Write a protein that binds this DNA or RNA. Structure first.
Lengths: 105, 294, 797
DNA sequence: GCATGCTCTACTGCTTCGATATCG
DNA sequence: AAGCAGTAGAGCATGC
């Protein structure tokens, strides 16, 4: 519910093409990432990563997409499951009569 | 509406009484609130729709005489403070407005034509705020107020606004029996009025209509013991007030009040050879016959 | 000090005036010489100590008389006239001695400065540099008192600028030279009152000084600039307190970049870190909404007082971010006060700065990019002076027409939306520029018509108007059949194109009927239309008789159809064509007549054209014979948008009843059966329980029968059914009695025998209401109707 | 936050009746 | 303590 409303807030943040709003939104999606690690909701995690990926790949937002591939915002890395001890390898292996008047004057 | 103006006034009294207990750090900010409000209500048009000074008179009347009907439930020591802030704001407004006559009194005109309207709004406002509740509050104010008004009136002679304020202060001084023993302040204010009466009496001979009525009203507001020493100089002002009173009824009122005060308090033999010309101009008022003047 | 000191307080004033006259003669020192050691005067410091120590009890609270204060000011002027005494007076001002009246505290130096304040300030301005140095030496010790004294000195030296204008700049320079001595004020973990005292001190300095806040020179600039930046960029302050560091941002929106980039940076951080999340979502009345509104008001004050692109761009971004911001009239008033300021160069800076907001790429939304022009730039262009509007025009001609000639991309909806929005915005800009420019510098041989071609030219000046009129006409006369992506955005684009066509034709064409060639010409055999492309043919319009909010005025009353953003310029052109140049109907009316009088046209077009005829009826009042059949057709028609006697039918029948004596519907039988159906419809739907509406309907029907009265069949069967209710507890028989009073009011008979009621039964159900003695409006109104009828039947036997 | 009627509710007066206390 | 006629004003709608 409030996750939905703040995802609308994040979409409004990507709606705004200013300078500090991008970092505000990447802080919000980092916060959503941390609380998705600590709420055991990996279905919704893959769902929102696909949501942002398909939204900003049917849209452009080239600068934020550059900071996505420059910081790292990607699908879950573990085993597409509820836990492992795995590094950022999955990030690295996934995304590396008018005619008359026209002269009658 | 009425009975909401009472609520607004209880609100303002509660604010002033709240910050009047906060020491003299905020007791200073009663003064600038009363001052800013007085400047605000004294810059209206001169007499949905626009209000004038006549509507704020009950506000400033309840402010200076109805702490008793308010504080005695609010869970004279504030009446006195608000009276002092009113008189301070009056002579502070007087010593700051620009009242200067420009050759456009042939056709003299105000250099500040907005400050002049503010001053005359202040005069007709203050004509009905000061005469109430004078029985102790004006008595330390008499000398300073009259002295400042006389010095402002000497350099602005043809004003018609300083004689009205001077008539107010000398009527308030007579209401509290200020000139009785005639205290170095009482004799100084006495001799000040003795000299200024003769100065206004000589300079009013050039004046024509409301300058003339203002100087006449000021001279006939003077006490008896200031007139009792120079009765022959003030008697023609009484004849001129009884003559101008046929068309201006307030001037007939101040003439009748002057004559009833003179005939009671001034001596019977200095008054005796002057009834031969004071009384014959009363015959214009006794011309009623109730025919078509029904 | 007391109530009887008048024989012993009269002599101190005398020796005070005596010693003042000695000091004027230049020999106060010779009579009263220094019995003290080096520089203090043994009499002067005794006087200062007397005045200072005699306002406090060492004896409850000495309340000053009116002359006690004036004697104290005289004693104080004498003490300062004896010489020296700046250091002891400053150390008396910064003294943490505490008093009490009866418990409240109020420090001794503060009360002393509050009482006198002006002799003290005149002294402290008389010996300046030692006062400021010894006063800012003790800034940490008593930070409230040094701020109070410096503020008093600074605004007292402001008021004396009519003679001592050199003193204020000296005091400002010396109070800036020691700005390191107040760096403990605008620090972290400082109380808010010292942070606000810095802002007040800076406000007074920047009021009295000029070349401190806007140069990169003079030395003191970095120390004030980091103070200002760190005060308005912090977190520990509050939003409405930080709003009071915005009212002196006028002094800083003139300095050239490098640092102006830093000022934009701290302002944008303040916006993204303190203002609501893009949609004014703070509920109105909470402590968040309050601080937001009072900060934005001071922000708009700063923008309107120091007009700059760095503030206009920022306030236009926050204005044009959502659908409607809270303070719309404030933003519009601030922009209207921005435009009309003289200085014909600095307006074009604002115009180019706010045009670049929607010209460039920076992709946000459709409404965001169109609101940059709509809520801000049109307001600027509609009030900027006429000379500053040709420079902006000449700057935008080439790129405008280069966008207007492009083709869209219907594969991808997003850039399609952006192209629609940009083309509509360009049509709006061209609309206003063609509106408020005279005809010579747009149509004769001038620099603007030269600047669409290369350099100048020799042509008579019609090389812009034609390529724009063809573009406008190809815009507002498109035709979709399978095209279904964005109907709303493209419909608004059609309306903007049509309005730009209006505003271009009302300027350069004046002769006879060049209006007709583009504004009122469709091609249904080629499907090249106008009004179907203008009006939304799907929306349900209401037309309510009664309203919650009254006075929906702009001027023409905006209801729902009257804010179509094409109705007001259409009424403008139609009122224009009446005073530029019977014969039955011109083609600019014959097109509307063929559009209005058909039940095969959509309904919203008929209601739109009807409201146009309503809003300008001084132009159809000459041709009222032709323009009364379709209006009456719409009034007495079947579908009108409401199930009663609504405002549209009230409006049509009121205008037509004004057209009496010019066209009565007694000529043709079509208008006669329309008038009869109109009367039966009005007499059926009268009631509407709000009694003023009931009386209004009755006055409508009465004025209708009084005006026409001839080609009408009174529906006597309906009136019989209206009063024939046999129920002695209902006011339902009052309606038939009122209609009967209406029809008896003019001349007309009761009971024409054609209605199958058999007059005995009719009149018996009429007179039977006399027995219904519960409400006066039944039996007494029935009695008065029977009296009128009986006078009638006696009158004509 | 005012002015004007209109309806209709609630009360009074009169009168009957019945329940209770009292007396030859 | 209830019927029964008579009235007066309380409370409310309404006013564009």
């Amino acid at each position: 519910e409030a996750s939905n409303q703040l995802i609308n807030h994040i979409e409004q943040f990507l709606d705004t093409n200013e300078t500090p709003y991008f970092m505000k939104s990447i802080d919000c999606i980092r916060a959503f990432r941390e609380e998705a690690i600590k709420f055991s909701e990996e279905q919704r995690f893959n769902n929102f990563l696909k949501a942002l990926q398909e939204k900003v790949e049917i849209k452009q937002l080239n600068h934020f997409w550059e900071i996505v591939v420059q910081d790292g915002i990607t699908l879950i890395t573990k085993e597409e499951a509820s836990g492992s001890s795995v590094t950022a390898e999955e990030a690295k292996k996934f995304l590396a009569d008018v005619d008359d008047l026209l002269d009658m004057i | 509406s009425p009975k909401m103006q009472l609520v607004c006034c209880r609100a303002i009294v509660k604010v002033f009484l709240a910050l009047a207990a906060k020491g003299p750090v905020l007791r200073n900010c009663i003064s600038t609130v009363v001052h800013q409000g007085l400047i605000r209500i004294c810059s209206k048009p001169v007499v949905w729709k626009v209000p004038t000074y006549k509507d704020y008179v009950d506000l400033f009347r309840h402010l200076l005489s109805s702490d008793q009907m308010m504080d005695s439930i609010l869970a004279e020591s504030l009446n006195h403070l608000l009276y002092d802030e009113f008189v301070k704001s009056v002579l502070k407004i007087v010593e700051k407005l620009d009242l200067t006559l420009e050759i456009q009194a042939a056709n003299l005109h105000p250099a500040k034509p907005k400050d002049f309207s503010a001053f005359i709004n202040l005069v007709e406002f203050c004509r009905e705020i000061l005469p109430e509740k004078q029985a102790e509050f004006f008595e330390p104010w008499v000398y300073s107020f009259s002295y400042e008004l006389i010095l402002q009136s000497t350099r602005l002679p043809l004003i018609s606004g300083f004689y009205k304020l001077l008539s107010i202060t000398v009527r308030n001084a007579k209401k509290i029996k200020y000139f009785e023993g005639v205290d170095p302040e009482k004799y100084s204010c006495f001799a000040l009025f003795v000299k200024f009466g003769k100065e206004v009496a000589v300079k009013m001979k050039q004046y024509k209509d409301e300058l003339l009525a203002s100087c006449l009203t000021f001279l006939l507001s003077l006490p008896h013991n200031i007139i009792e020493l120079d009765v022959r100089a003030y008697v023609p002002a009484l004849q001129m007030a009884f003559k101008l009173g046929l068309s201006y009824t307030p001037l007939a009122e101040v003439g009748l009040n002057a004559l009833e005060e003179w005939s009671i308090y001034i001596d019977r033999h200095v008054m005796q050879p002057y009834y031969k010309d004071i009384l014959p101009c009363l015959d214009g008022y006794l011309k009623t016959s109730a025919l078509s003047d029904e | 000090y007391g109530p009887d000191a008048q024989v012993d307080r009269s002599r101190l004033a005398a020796v005070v005036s005596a010693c003042k006259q000695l000091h004027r003669a230049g020999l106060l020192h010779n009579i009263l010489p220094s019995q003290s050691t080096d520089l203090h005067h043994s009499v002067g410091t005794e006087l200062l100590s007397l005045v200072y120590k005699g306002i406090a009890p060492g004896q409850c609270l000495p309340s000053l008389d009116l002359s006690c204060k004036q004697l104290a000011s005289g004693l104080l002027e004498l003490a300062f006239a004896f010489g020296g005494l700046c250091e002891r007076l400053v150390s008396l001002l910064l003294n943490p001695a505490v008093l009490s009246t009866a418990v409240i505290h109020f420090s001794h130096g503060e009360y002393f400065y509050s009482l006198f304040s002006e002799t003290i300030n005149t002294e402290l301005l008389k010996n300046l540099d030692l006062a400021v140095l010894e006063l800012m030496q003790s800034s940490v010790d008593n930070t409230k008192m040094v701020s109070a004294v410096l503020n008093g000195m600074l605004d007292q030296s402001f008021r004396e600028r009519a003679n001592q204008k050199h003193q204020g700049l000296k005091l400002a320079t010396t109070i800036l030279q020691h700005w390191k001595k107040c760096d403990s004020w605008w620090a972290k973990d400082s109380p808010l009152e010292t942070k606000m005292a810095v802002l007040a001190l800076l406000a007074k300095i920047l009021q009295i000084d000029s070349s401190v806040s806007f140069n990169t020179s003079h030395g003191s600039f970095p120390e004030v600039f980091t103070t200002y930046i760190s005060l308005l960029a912090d977190t520990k302050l509050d939003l409405h307190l930080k709003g009071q560091a915005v009212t002196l941002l006028p002094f800083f929106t003139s300095l050239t970049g490098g640092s102006l980039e830093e000022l934009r940076r701290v302002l944008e951080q303040l916006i993204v870190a303190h203002f609501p999340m893009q949609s004014r979502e703070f509920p109105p009345g909470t402590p968040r909404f309050n601080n937001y509104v009072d900060c934005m008001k001071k922000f708009l004050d700063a923008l309107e007082l120091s007009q700059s692109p760095m503030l206009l761009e920022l306030m236009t971004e926050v204005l044009c971010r959502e659908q409607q911001h809270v303070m719309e009239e404030l933003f519009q008033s601030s922009f209207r006060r921005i435009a009309r300021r003289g200085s014909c160069v600095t307006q074009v800076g604002l115009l180019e700065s706010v045009y670049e907001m929607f010209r460039k790429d920076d992709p946000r939304l459709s409404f965001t990019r169109q609101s940059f022009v709509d809520r801000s730039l049109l307001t600027l262009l509609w009030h900027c002076s006429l000379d500053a509007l040709r420079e902006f025009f000449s700057t935008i001609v080439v790129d405008a027409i280069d966008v207007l000639k492009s083709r869209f991309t219907k594969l991808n909806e997003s850039t399609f939306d952006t192209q629609i929005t940009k083309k509509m915005g360009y049509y709006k800009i061209l609309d206003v520029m063609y509106s408020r420019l005279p005809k010579d510098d747009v149509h004769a041989k001038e620099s603007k018509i030269n600047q669409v071609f290369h350099g100048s030219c020799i042509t008579e000046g019609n090389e812009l108007t034609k390529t724009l009129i063809k573009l406008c006409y190809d815009a507002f006369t498109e035709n979709m059949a399978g095209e279904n992506q964005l109907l709303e955005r493209r419909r608004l684009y059609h309306c903007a194109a049509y309005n730009c066509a209006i505003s271009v034709i009302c300027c350069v064409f004046n002769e006879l009927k060049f209006y007709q060639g583009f504004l009122f010409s469709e091609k249904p055999e080629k499907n090249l239309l106008i009004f179907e492309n203008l009006i939304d043919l799907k929306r349900r319009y209401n037309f309510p008789v009664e309203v919650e909010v009254p006075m929906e005025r702009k001027e023409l009353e905006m209801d729902e159809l009257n804010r179509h953003e094409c109705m007001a310029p259409l009424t403008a052109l139609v009122k224009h064509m009446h005073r530029s140049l019977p014969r039955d109907l011109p083609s600019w009316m014959k097109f509307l007549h063929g559009k209005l009088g058909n039940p095969i046209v959509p309904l919203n077009i008929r209601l739109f054209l009807a409201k146009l005829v309503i809003n300008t009826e001084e132009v159809f009042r000459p041709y009222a014979k032709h323009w009364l059949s379709p209006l009456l057709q719409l009034a007495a028609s079947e579908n009108n948008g409401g199930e009663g006697i609504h405002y549209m039918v009230v409006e049509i029948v009121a205008t037509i009843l004004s057209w009496t004596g010019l066209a009565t519907p007694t000529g043709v039988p079509k208008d006669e059966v329309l008038a009869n159906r109109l009367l039966n419809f009005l007499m059926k739907h009268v009631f509407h329980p709000k009694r003023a509406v009931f009386r209004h309907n009755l006055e409508i029907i009465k004025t209708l029968v009084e005006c026409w009265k001839d080609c009408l069949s009174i529906p006597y069967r309906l009136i019989f059914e209206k009063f024939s209710g046999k129920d002695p507890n209902s006011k339902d028989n009052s309606v038939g009695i009122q209609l009967l009073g209406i029809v008896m009011a003019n001349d007309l008979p009761p009971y024409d025998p054609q209605c199958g009621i058999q007059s005995s039964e009719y009149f018996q159900a009429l007179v039977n209401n006399m027995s219904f003695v519960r409400y006066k409006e039944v039996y007494a109104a029935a009695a008065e109707v029977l009296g009128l009828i009986l006078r009638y039947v006696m009158e004509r036997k």
